[PDB]
Amino acid sequence: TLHALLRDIPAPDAEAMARTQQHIDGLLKPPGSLGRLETLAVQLAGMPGLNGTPQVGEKAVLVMCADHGVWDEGVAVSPKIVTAIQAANMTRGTTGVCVLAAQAGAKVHVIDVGIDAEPIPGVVNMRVARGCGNIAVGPAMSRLQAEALLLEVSRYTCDLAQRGVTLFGVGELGMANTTPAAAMVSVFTGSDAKEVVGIGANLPPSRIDNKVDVVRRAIAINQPNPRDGIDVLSKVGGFDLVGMTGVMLGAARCGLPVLLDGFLSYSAALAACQIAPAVRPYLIPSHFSAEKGARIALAHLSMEPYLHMAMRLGEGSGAALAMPIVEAACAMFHNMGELAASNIVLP
Amino acid sequence: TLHALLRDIPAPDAEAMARTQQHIDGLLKPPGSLGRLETLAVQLAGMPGLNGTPQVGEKAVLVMCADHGVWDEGVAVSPKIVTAIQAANMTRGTTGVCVLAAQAGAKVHVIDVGIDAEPIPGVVNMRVARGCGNIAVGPAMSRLQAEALLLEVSRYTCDLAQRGVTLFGVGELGMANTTPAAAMVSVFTGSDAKEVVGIGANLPPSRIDNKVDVVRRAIAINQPNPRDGIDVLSKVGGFDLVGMTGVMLGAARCGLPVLLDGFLSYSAALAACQIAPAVRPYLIPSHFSAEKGARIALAHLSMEPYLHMAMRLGEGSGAALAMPIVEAACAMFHNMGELAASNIVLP
Numbered sequence: 001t002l003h004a005l006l007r008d009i010p011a012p013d014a015e016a017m018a019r020t021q022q023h024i025d026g027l028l029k030p031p032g033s034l035g036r037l038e039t040l041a042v043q044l045a046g047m048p049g050l051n052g053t054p055q056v057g058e059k060a061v062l063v064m065c066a067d068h069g070v071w072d073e074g075v076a077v078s079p080k081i082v083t084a085i086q087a088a089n090m091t092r093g094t095t096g097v098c099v100l101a102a103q104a105g106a107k108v109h110v111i112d113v114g115i116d117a118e119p120i121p122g123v124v125n126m127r128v129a130r131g132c133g134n135i136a137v138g139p140a141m142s143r144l145q146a147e148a149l150l151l152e153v154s155r156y157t158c159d160l161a162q163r164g165v166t167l168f169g170v171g172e173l174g175m176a177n178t179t180p181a182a183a184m185v186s187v188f189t190g191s192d193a194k195e196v197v198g199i200g201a202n203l204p205p206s207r208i209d210n211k212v213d214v215v216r217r218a219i220a221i222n223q224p225n226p227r228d229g230i231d232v233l234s235k236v237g238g239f240d241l242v243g244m245t246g247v248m249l250g251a252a253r254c255g256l257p258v259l260l261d262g263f264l265s266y267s268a269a270l271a272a273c274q275i276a277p278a279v280r281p282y283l284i285p286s287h288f289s290a291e292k293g294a295r296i297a298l299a300h301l302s303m304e305p306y307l308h309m310a311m312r313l314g315e316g317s318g319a320a321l322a323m324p325i326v327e328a329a330c331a332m333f334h335n336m337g338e339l340a341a342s343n344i345v346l347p
Numbered sequence: 348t349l350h351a352l353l354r355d356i357p358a359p360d361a362e363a364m365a366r367t368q369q370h371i372d373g374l375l376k377p378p379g380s381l382g383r384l385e386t387l388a389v390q391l392a393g394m395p396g397l398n399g400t401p402q403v404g405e406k407a408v409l410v411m412c413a414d415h416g417v418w419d420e421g422v423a424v425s426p427k428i429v430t431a432i433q434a435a436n437m438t439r440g441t442t443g444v445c446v447l448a449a450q451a452g453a454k455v456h457v458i459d460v461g462i463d464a465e466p467i468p469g470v471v472n473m474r475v476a477r478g479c480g481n482i483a484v485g486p487a488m489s490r491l492q493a494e495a496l497l498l499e500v501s502r503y504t505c506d507l508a509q510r511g512v513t514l515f516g517v518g519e520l521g522m523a524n525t526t527p528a529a530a531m532v533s534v535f536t537g538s539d540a541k542e543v544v545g546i547g548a549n550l551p552p553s554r555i556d557n558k559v560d561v562v563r564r565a566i567a568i569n570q571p572n573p574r575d576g577i578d579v580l581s582k583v584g585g586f587d588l589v590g591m592t593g594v595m596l597g598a599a600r601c602g603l604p605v606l607l608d609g610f611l612s613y614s615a616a617l618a619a620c621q622i623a624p625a626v627r628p629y630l631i632p633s634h635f636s637a638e639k640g641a642r643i644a645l646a647h648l649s650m651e652p653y654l655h656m657a658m659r660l661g662e663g664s665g666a667a668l669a670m671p672i673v674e675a676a677c678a679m680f681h682n683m684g685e686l687a688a689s690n691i692v693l694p
């Protein structure tokens with residue numbers, strides 16, 4: 001089933017991309033003058049789910065919520081209940097992503113993949129358990145739990161495509177999740193924990209040493225295999241991270257674009273690309289996270305964010321903020337006039 | 348008159364900014380987690396024309412169009428008539444800024460401050476002459492012509508404020524204008540011409556040496572005084588550059604925000620800040636121009652753009668692209684919920 005999923009991810013349509021480039025070169029402007037906006041429009045044109053042209057229909061931001069057992073290691077200053085409280089606030093439209101998604105005309109889907117609290121009405125229920133295992137002393141979950149969630153979220157994502165959604169944004173919510181995210185980044189990039197462990201949600205500079213030690217213990221004890229993205233996710237990841245990876249696999253299978261968010265999303269994208277390299281062409285960066293390990297993670301994904309906002313909230317807020325940029329590349333493509341029509345000739 | 352203008356530019360309102368910061372710190376998120384979006388909202392709150400709160404009413408992009416005599420020195424590959432043709436296309440909504448402004452819900456004002464062609468219907472007429480003087484052999488214009496245009500554009504800009512406009516964007520259109528822009532940057536920053544001369548609108552790499560020589564000749568022959576922003580503008584600038592500087596002085600006098608665009612706008616902002624330092628707090632960067640001298644210009648304005656799009660079209664296209672970011676900071680401020688209301692307490 002998951003093998004079928006991964007097997008059926010479409011390659012980009014080179015024919016549509018060639019037609020796109022030619023059309024862009026003929027627009028009313030010096031060739032290549034709109035830089036990354038042009039490359040973005042061509043990238044979009046190659047995505048099968050977009051019907052050979054850069055376009056944006058409905059937009060959705062999927063927010064994966066879960067708690068982590070590693071919170072008990074004192075790696076986070078936010079009360080663990082904030083996960084459940086914020087998840088509820090998501091249904092009320094008062095959070096950061098809700099406000100930014102509203103601005104971009106996108107709908108937010110709040111998905112509970114493992115919150116340690118009673119079920120929250122209004123939230124999509126896909127909970128694996130009440131929080132994942134404490135990665136400092138063992139695995140976050142079993143391989144089967146990771147594979148099942150990947151499959152479940154993948155299907156949900158591509159099912160939305162059937163309802164008009166053509167652009168996705170990924171996000172998360174889970175106290176302490178920058179710890180497993182750092183563990184995954186260290187494992188995938190081969191970087192020492194000290195280089196990728198950040199302050200997360202305002203962790204005091206005096207408590208960073210403990211966080212670094214926790215990440216190292218998690219790796220030593222679990223011995224995750226860097227060449228097996230699912231092994232890494234299940235051992236030192238979390239339900240929320242798995243869920244984000246699932247959105248990326250689902251959209252790619254659907255041949256549609258996915259906007260990344262911040263540091264947590266970069267770790268999930270590293271896992272997704274390890275599991276299936278064919279997912280890469282569907283990923284679009286949004287902003288450059290203020291988290292310490294962002295530069296290393298982005299270098300390994302070979303991505304250069306469009307927005308430098310020093311943001312570090314998460315929730316998919318950066319993804320929503322970049323949606324207007326994607327629509328701008330589409331507007332450029334479809335609405336600009338052409339050089340030939342104005343009798344303009346440039347060498 | 349111009350002395351009155353410069354004298355009456357308001358200082359930022361520290362009281363409104365303090366109230367803004369306190370409100371932002373209390374929003375439903377870890378303090379400072381939205382980074383530059385928070386600093387932007389506070390900056391806006393201090394602008395008197397915004398009534399003590401970050402808000403955006405109507406938006407306008409002012410595009411200054413003019414031709415340059417230095418075009419005859421072979422520093423540009425685009426036919427000189429493109430200025431007049433593109434200015435006309437601006438009235439038809441087919442250009443890059445028109446499409447991006449439409450996306451942001453902004454109106455484009457096309458202003459002819461010196462196009463070397465017959466008047467174009469639909470374009471605001473403020474032409475000083477049919478193109479400015481060739482800066483390679485003398486001044487672009489007289490000091491009085493520069494001062495008069497500054498005053499004229501300044502008044503037009505603040506007059507729009509009376510019609511609901513609260514956010515401005517500046518742009519230009521003029522073949523060969525990256526040459527005087529480079530001259531101004533060299534003069535204001537004390538950088539050698541070779542470090543700030545770029546390829547402009549696809550100038551062949553083999554013709555760059557000539558462009559560098561032209562910039563040096565312009566400076567040697569005119570001897571512009573770096574401490575007199577108006578002296579520099581009139582000697583080695585152009586009508587379009589003067590006009591952009593005028594929008595910045597007008598909006599600041601009006602106590603309203605102005606979004607910069609690319610390299611041409613950075614040179615105009617250096618002039619404006621030299622003429623009146625009080626203008627600085629009203630300037631908002633948009634993107635990081637692909638032009639070679641952008642890094643140096645931005646360092647001297649002490650600005651860090653939000654968008655890295657490798658754009659180099661001009662027209663105010665980058666300014667329009669960043670307008671959604673300004674509205675996002677306002678939406679964050681007014682629409683997010685508060686920590687206290689959810690009983691959340693963070694150290």
Ligand SMILES: O=C(O)c1ccc[n+]([C@@H]2O[C@H](COP(=O)([O-])O)[C@@H](O)[C@H]2O)c1
Nearest residue numbers: 076174176178200201262263289313314
């Ligand atoms: O998206 C980022 O780059 C990001 C960077 C730092 C912190 N966060 C958010 O803060 C939480 C993780 O921080 P922490 O200290 O509990 O590990 C989680 O709920 C994220 O939404 C998010």
Ligand SMILES: O=C(O)c1ccc[n+]([C@@H]2O[C@H](COP(=O)([O-])O)[C@@H](O)[C@H]2O)c1
Nearest residue numbers: 423521523525547548609610636660661
């Ligand atoms: O805005 C920029 O950063 C920008 C950078 C390079 C070129 N341009 C545009 O191209 C023109 C100047 O290029 P050039 O080669 O004629 O000096 C002018 O009409 C600008 O709108 C604009």
Ligand SMILES: Cc1ccc(C)c(N)c1
Nearest residue numbers: 028029030425429433548
């Ligand atoms: C077509 C065309 C050519 C050159 C420039 C600078 C613009 N703005 C447009």
Ligand SMILES: Cc1ccc(C)c(N)c1
Nearest residue numbers: 078082086201375376377
């Ligand atoms: C309030 C609050 C606290 C911590 C985080 C990570 C979010 N998203 C929100």
